[PDB]
Design a protein around this ligand. Structure first.
Ligand SMILES: N#CCc1c[nH]c2ccc(Cl)cc12
Length: 126
């Protein structure tokens, strides 16, 4: 169902959270080669998450689950903030700008939290 598909999306989102936290520790320890690999893996994981979230939203729309559509619309907006800041972080890494990377990483932790509160309601709504 859409509900089991959202559980699959949630796990993928949580796989990115785990990798992100591993990457943060690598950045702090100054392991740049590891960071580069983790950033590539994260991009793949976010692209997958986005794909799954869009299909779920489109399905909720076709099913007429108005409360779920409202919540998912809010979450897709938050997801795009994540995307914009993530891309900025990757650019900061490419440019050798550790100050911006630090800033963007702290910002993404805020986005993740505000997304998590929204994701928990979506699950209950589908
Ligand atoms: N939280 C977070 C990061 C993120 C959200 N949406 C994304 C879409 C694409 C890429 Cl590469 C990254 C992201």
């Amino acid at each position: 169902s859409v509900k089991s598909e959202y559980a699959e999306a949630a796990a993928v989102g949580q796989e990115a959270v785990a990798v992100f936290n591993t990457m943060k520790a690598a950045f702090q320890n100054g392991d740049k080669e590891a960071v580069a690999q983790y950033l590539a893996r994260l991009a793949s994981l976010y692209t997958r998450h986005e794909e799954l979230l869009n299909r779920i939203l489109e399905k909720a729309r076709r099913e007429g689950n108005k409360e779920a559509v409202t919540l998912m619309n809010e979450f897709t907006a938050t997801f795009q903030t994540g995307k914009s800041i993530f891309n900025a972080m990757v650019a900061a890494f490419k440019n050798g700008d550790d100050d911006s990377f630090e800033s963007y990483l702290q910002a993404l932790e805020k986005v993740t939290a505000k997304g998590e509160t929204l994701a928990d309601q979506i699950a209950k709504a589908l």
